Amino acid sequence: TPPNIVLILCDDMGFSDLGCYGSEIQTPNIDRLAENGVRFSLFKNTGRCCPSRAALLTGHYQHEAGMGWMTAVDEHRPGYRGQITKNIPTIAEVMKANGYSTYMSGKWHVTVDGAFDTPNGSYPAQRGFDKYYGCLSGGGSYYKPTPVYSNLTRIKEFPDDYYYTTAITDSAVSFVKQHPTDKPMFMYVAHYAPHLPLQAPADRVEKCRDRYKVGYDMLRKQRFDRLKELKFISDEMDYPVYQKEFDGKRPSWETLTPKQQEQWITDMATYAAMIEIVDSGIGELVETIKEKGMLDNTVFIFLSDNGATKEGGYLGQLMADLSNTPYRSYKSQCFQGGTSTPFILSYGDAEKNKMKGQICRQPAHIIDILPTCMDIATATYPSEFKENLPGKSLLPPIHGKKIKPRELYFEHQSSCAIISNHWKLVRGSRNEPWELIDLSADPFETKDLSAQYPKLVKKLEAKWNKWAKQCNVFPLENKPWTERINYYLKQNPDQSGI
């Protein structure tokens, strides 16, 4: 059979949150996949949950798939349907067409929020997955997610010790146990952790608490120094302290009150525990693949949907500053902090890892997941659809072939970016000017060159506008969350996603 693929996606995890990307968070099972396999330094995602999940599932830019913004509202306009289109197959439908058994555990977040009570054609088990267990929602608690579905069956009752991360791991383990080993398996594990709220069993929090007592300044510099030791960042690079995003008043650890420090420690220890429990679960899933005799014919892939968030509030922004090290800004904008993710690709067969323990510096985007999975599987695109995938297989550069130049596109809430070769043109919103960043010299986006290269600003801006028009990105929208939902509910309260 062609190789099994286990595709693991964490939620709002920052660039340096894994041990193998310089973390104080202990991720021994993920780090072992990295040691066996390859880590990417320049893998980017969209900056937000629903767009990243649409792009991952389709291999297309988010607006082409109908998810320019979020499942919170269907805007009833091209690019912004709050839901993945029927008109582009998902990775599950592609793998199924090539004889794969398809399983998904965890967070979907590409079905319109108004369609949570009855399947509307966009549910996981209607879009290529033979088995699904998880919550369709992008939000909610670890103790009672809603709505939870087993395929198309609504689950209303939960055992008294329910924890969503544990249920995701246990459902994935159960799918592998039941998997007929004469068939290839495609397994998507969409973890909720470390998405808010901050919830974890007390023993795992207390296991993490001590290391956070030193505060974020000591921990953040230590992550930076580990990123140099690990060869993610050149020895000469200065430790970046970001002031712009804190309105010029970034509070040093010593500036917080005792009560604020104690709350930051508890919050970050809880965040760490949430990731450690995912890592324990990855351990369990790897153990199950071994027991089933599947390891030597399995490929593991790990990434995050978007950078760490400041949505938790003031102390949450300081958590996200630490998590996104060395990069600026957060989830929901197109700077490096919101868009940079770890990316690991690990063959269970040691001999199939041609860059064992190394970093691959191929620039890449979450659109690359589907063509990479099709290359692993020697899979053909379903014959009823024209194959127009904009992304690239990432297999050639980890099998010794030369890095290829990329042109990558970003938009979220009128935050916009194009990466073209070593250049990044980026804006925080339509209310902020384009900034031109030389990523080769200035990966932390600290020095705007736009005044120095006005012709290049114009060329990159024109490339971005051509992409945006072609992908149904326009018009841009930046109304904040509640105002935006109310506006489009008023325009058209049909949130059925039919």
Ligand X SMILES: CC(=O)N[C@@H]1[C@@H](O)[C@H](O[C@@H]2O[C@H](CO)[C@H](O)[C@H](O)[C@H]2O)[C@@H](CO)O[C@@H]1O
Residue 97, both tokens: 């067409």
Instruction: Name the H helices within 354-453.
Output: 369-376, 395-398
- Is the distance from CB of 5 to CB of 299 less than 8 angstroms? yes
Question: Considering only residues 32-61, where is the footprint of ligand X by CB under 6 A?
Answer: 49
Neighbours of 354 (CB within 10 A): 13
Name the minimum Å distance from CB 310 to ligand X. 9
Cβ neighbours of 446 (radius 10 Å): 13
Residue 305 binds what, of Ca ion, ligand X, none (CB under 5 to 8 Å, by partner type)?
A: Ca ion
Q: Does 46 bind Ca ion (CB under 5 A)?
A: no
Q: Which stretch binds Ca ion (CB under 5 A): 48-56, 72-80, 94-102, 153-161?
A: 48-56
Residue given tokens 């309105």 in the structure block = 247
Judged by beta carbon distances under 5 to 8 A according to partner kind, the member of ligand X, Ca ion, none in contact with residue 311 is ligand X
Would you say 217 or 245 has its CB closer to ligand X? 245
Give me the least distance between CB of 203 and ligand X, in Å please.
26
Selected range binding Ca ion among 49-57, 73-81, 341-349, 439-447, rule: CB under 5 A:
49-57
Q: Is 137 in the site for ligand X (CB under 6 A)?
A: yes
Torsion from C-alpha of 60, 65, 67, 68, nearest 10 degrees: 70
Does position 481 interact with ligand X (CB under 6 A)? The reply is yes
Among ligand X, Ca ion, none, what does residue 306 contact (CB within 5–8 Å per kind)?
A: Ca ion
- 146 vs 358, beta carbon nearer Ca ion: 146
Hey, how many other C-beta atoms are within 10 angstroms of the C-beta on 431? 8
When asked if residue 314 is in the footprint of ligand X (CB under 6 A), the reply is: no
If you search the block for the tokens 């659109």, which residue do you land on? 367
- Taking residues 8 to 27 in sequence order and writing x for each that binds Ca ion by CB under 5 A, - otherwise, the string is ---xx---------------
> Considering the rule CB under 6 A, would residue 487 count as an interface residue with ligand X?
no
Q: Which is nearer to ligand X, 181 or 486 (CB)?
A: 486
Spatial contact of 341 and 43, defined as CB atoms under 8 Å apart? yes
Is 49 or 84 the residue whose CB approaches ligand X more closely? 49
Broken C–N links (> 2.5 Å) in the chain, after residues? none
Residues contacting 94, CB < 8 A, separation 6+:
128, 370, 373, 374, 379, 381, 382
Judged by CB under 6 A, the number of residues near ligand X is 7
Q: Would you call 446 helix, strand, or coil by DSSP?
A: coil
Q: Which residues bind ligand X (CB under 6 A)?
A: 49, 137-139, 311, 481-482
